[PDB]
Amino acid sequence: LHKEPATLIKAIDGDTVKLMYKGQPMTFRLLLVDTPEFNEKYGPEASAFTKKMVENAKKIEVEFDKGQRTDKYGRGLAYIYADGKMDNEALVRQGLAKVAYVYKGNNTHEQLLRKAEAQAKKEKLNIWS
Ligand SMILES: Cc1cn([C@H]2C[C@H](OP(=O)(O)O)[C@@H](COP(=O)(O)O)O2)c(=O)[nH]c1=O
Ligand SMILES: [Ca+2]
């Protein structure tokens, strides 16, 4: 996989963000995770966590996987990095997302994220409390 440039347009919630990618605005949905909706328990914390990561980043990058690059809603499907740190993994490691929506052929980082979930779960963090 390859990292490509993007710039923040605006945070949306724990697992979606609006970025400018190849000069076009698009909403990105984070691969392989599910944060609670803003209206649910840990939803505000998930939203906050992603907002902070992307707004503080000097460099945002998007990494597509091998499979579909947009979903049925026209959202980009990617791993999103803030100064080299992957938000997808970070939200899971913090107990602010569950590994979810693991579809064949867009699952390159599946093991890495499950390992993070196992550790968040061992620590009883947030969702796992
Ligand atoms: C993360 C992801 C979501 N989706 C679709 C599946 C779900 O369809 P449904 O809306 O029919 O439930 C939806 C969940 O996204 P959200 O968790 O943002 O609601 O997004 C994909 O198709 N591929 C993906 O990789
Ligand atoms: Ca969600």
| 114 included as an active-site residue | no
The CA-based angle 110-66-73, given to 5 degrees, is 90
Nearest ligand to the CA of 75 is: 1
CA of 96 from ligand 1 middle (Å) equals 17
- The tokens for 111 are 């093991």
Calpha distance 55→44 (Å, rounded)? 16
CA of 90 from ligand 1 middle (Å) equals 20
Q: Which residues contact residue 60 at a Cβ distance below 8 angstroms, ignoring those fewer than 6 apart?
A: 5, 6, 7, 8, 19, 54, 80, 81, 82
Q: How many residues does the chain have?
A: 129
| 37 included as an active-site residue | yes
Domain boundaries, the chain: 1-129
- The tokens for 116 are 């993070």
Closest CA to 12 of 46, 42, 56: 46
Instruction: Select the CATH number that applies to the domain covering 1-129 from these four: 2.40.50.90, 3.40.50.300, 1.10.1060.10, 3.40.30.10.
Output: 2.40.50.90
Choose the catalytic residue: 29, 89, 93, 117. 29
